[PDB]
Design a protein around this ligand. Structure first.
Ligand SMILES: [Mg+2]
Ligand SMILES: [Mg+2]
Lengths: 234, 234
């Protein structure tokens, strides 16, 4: 792959992380040495068992490593390791939606089923996913019962709790974390690092805005809109 | 009253527990209130019995009027605690509106279902147990008879609805005192009915007011935890 294979060369990476997405929408990864990865591999692919989407079939589907883009040096891990978030899942014959259905291929299908309809050449999606960051989170479910607890310094209810560094008293009140200044915000540098990592991954620009969402411990980072099968990967 | 309080205090104490006749000790749950039932008899005949309104004599209508007129002042002596105004809050189970009905809540004055007109009485729901029985009962009578003497009309009875939309009304509906502060200011202005009969000397009333003001001082001087919540990080 012009992108991937060249990136491998430039990075001097020894490891290539094939990443795909399960039906439930959870990214999965398997790691190969660079030696096995050739241009032909993008065509031929690397084969593997099916244990999430499928079963009983004893399915030996192939991970057709997709090539353009999603060729990102693994920002977090130690050894130089690019990722190929682009790994469409293909059946052995009928190069198609593997297992029950590979989401990425379903999306590729829809990509075609827009030009084919002659309605449009491309479709653009710009998601605004919100997340919470906690210090720590605990839960268990037994016959004894079901229990779950949220733990965070920034949590609205953490006033009155004891801390090592002491309690600042500067924390968002309930619903009232809409953009107050850093004493209480207690994120910022973290969001910044998140943004920096994003740029490492997808590319320069791409990151629009970072702010604190309303709920205590709730943060939003904005990423640029893109086409499907691109934005989806992003 | 005093004997009742004593009993409950001590019985509880014997059960290793503690009793309090405070209003609103717990926020977010019901306050403790002292509804006061009142009747007048003359040569052993209930003067409150009649056929004016829901079995009420004109006498009793005037009793009502006087109390409604002098209510804000009456809020000291009855509701004589800063805590009292935690109870007297725009919500449900709240005798905050200065009105009368037999079948309406949010009526500060209510006419009990008495069956036999022999025991016909009137109930004032705004007082809390903090009221001095002696001083409190007395003040209610004095205000009541001011009504009678001046033939004070209690106005129309609102039986319809507690608190609804403002047709420039309901907003206009009179409310009891918001603070001991206000109640004491009210009693400064309107103490005349008490002084009649020389029942209440001006020595004691002006004393009482000052002594109660120390309670107000305490509250107003002492920062409340809640202020931390709102103001600490501004
Ligand atoms: Mg938002
Ligand atoms: Mg009652």
């Amino acid at each position: 792959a012009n992108k991937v294979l060249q990136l491998i060369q430039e990075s001097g990476a020894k490891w290539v992380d094939f990443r795909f997405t399960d039906t439930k929408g959870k990214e999965q990864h398997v790691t190969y040495p660079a030696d096995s990865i050739d241009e032909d591999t993008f065509e031929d692919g690397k084969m593997f068992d099916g244990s999430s989407i499928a079963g009983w079939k004893g399915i030996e589907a192939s991970d057709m490593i997709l090539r353009p883009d999603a060729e990102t040096g693994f920002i977090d891990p130690f050894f130089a390791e690019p990722t190929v978030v682009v790994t469409c899942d293909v059946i052995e014959p009928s190069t198609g939606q593997g297992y029950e259905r590979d989401p990425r291929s379903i999306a590729r299908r829809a990509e075609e089923y827009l030009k084919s309809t002659g309605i449009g050449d491309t479709a653009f999606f710009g998601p605004e996913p919100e997340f919470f960051v906690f210090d720590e989170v605990k839960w268990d479910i037994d016959m004894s019962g079901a229990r779950h607890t949220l733990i965070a310094e920034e949590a609205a209810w953490s006033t009155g709790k004891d801390y090592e560094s002491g309690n600042s008293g500067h924390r968002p009140r309930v619903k009232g974390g809409y953009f107050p200044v850093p004493p209480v915000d207690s994120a910022q540098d973290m969001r910044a690092e998140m943004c920096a990592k994003i740029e490492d991954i997808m590319g320069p620009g791409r990151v629009e805005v970072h702010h604190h969402e309303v709920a205590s411990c709730q943060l939003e980072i904005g990423v640029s809109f893109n086409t499907l099968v691109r934005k989806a990967d992003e | 009253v005093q004997q009742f309080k004593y009993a409950v205090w001590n019985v509880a104490h014997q059960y290793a527990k503690t009793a309090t006749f405070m209003p609103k000790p717990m926020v977010g749950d019901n306050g403790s209130g002292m509804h006061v039932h009142m009747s007048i008899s003359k040569d052993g005949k209930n003067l409150f019995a009649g056929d004016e309104y829901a079995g009420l004599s004109e006498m009793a209508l005037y009793f009502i009027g006087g109390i409604i007129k002098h209510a804000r002042a009456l809020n000291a002596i009855t509701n004589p605690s800063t805590n009292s105004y935690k109870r007297l809050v725009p919500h449900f189970e709240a005798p905050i509106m200065l009105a009368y009905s037999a079948r309406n809540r949010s009526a500060s004055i209510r006419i009990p279902y008495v069956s036999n007109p022999k025991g016909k009485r009137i109930e004032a729901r705004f007082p809390d147990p903090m009221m001095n029985p002696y001083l409190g009962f007395a003040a209610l009578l004095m205000a009541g008879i001011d009504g009678i003497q001046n033939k004070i009309h209690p106005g129309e009875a609102a039986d319809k609805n507690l608190y609804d939309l403002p047709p420039e009304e309901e907003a206009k509906i009179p409310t009891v005192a918001h603070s001991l502060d206000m109640a004491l200011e009210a009693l400064q202005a309107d103490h005349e009915f008490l002084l009649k009969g020389g029942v209440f000397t001006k020595e004691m009333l002006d004393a009482y007011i000052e002594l109660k003001t120390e309670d107000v001082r305490r509250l107003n001087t002492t920062t409340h935890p809640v202020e931390f919540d709102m103001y600490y990080s501004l």
